[PDB]
Design a protein around this ligand. Structure first.
Ligand code: K24
Ligand code: ZN
Length: 140
């Protein structure tokens, strides 16, 4: 589990979105495994705007932050997990690292701020849904 809290927005894995998230929907994309909802209090995270390929991600299934190199966002075939089938997912970044289903929501961060959240994994590759293209998260 986990979210990004940027201004009055809440960024979560679409598959982990709550009823309240869907009842306060700003934007959602199944292909990206992303859903954004409204908040009342302002959030403490800042979004990276950058093409960084190095950063650090939180891995709840290890209680550890790991430094990783990661691929630029792209359309990758993801095998089946507990929450999705063997399908394709867009705006995905992969690193070599440990990931389990409950690690989804863990932040990936670079020197510029939050890059993305754990979304996919399999055979020692953790996948992150990118948010750095969501400029609209910075305004209104
Ligand atoms: C977010 N990571 C995962 O849910 C997975 C890692 N390995 C799998 C077979 S599913
Ligand atoms: Zn960066």
């Amino acid at each position: 589990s986990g979210a990004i809290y940027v201004g009055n927005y809440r960024v979560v894995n679409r598959h982990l979105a709550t009823h309240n998230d869907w009842a306060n929907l700003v934007w959602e994309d199944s292909s990206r495994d992303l859903l954004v909802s409204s908040t009342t209090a302002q959030g403490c995270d800042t979004i990276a705007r950058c093409d960084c390929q190095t950063g650090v991600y939180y891995c709840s299934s290890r209680r550890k932050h790991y430094p990783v190199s990661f691929s630029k966002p792209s359309l990758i075939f993801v095998e089946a997990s507990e929450y999705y089938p063997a399908r394709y997912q867009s705006h995905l970044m992969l690193a070599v690292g440990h990931s389990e289903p409950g690690d989804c929501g863990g932040i990936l961060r670079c020197q510029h701020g939050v890059v993305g959240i754990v979304s996919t994994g399999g055979n020692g590759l953790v996948g992150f849904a990118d948010v750095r293209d969501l400029l609209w998260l910075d305004e209104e």
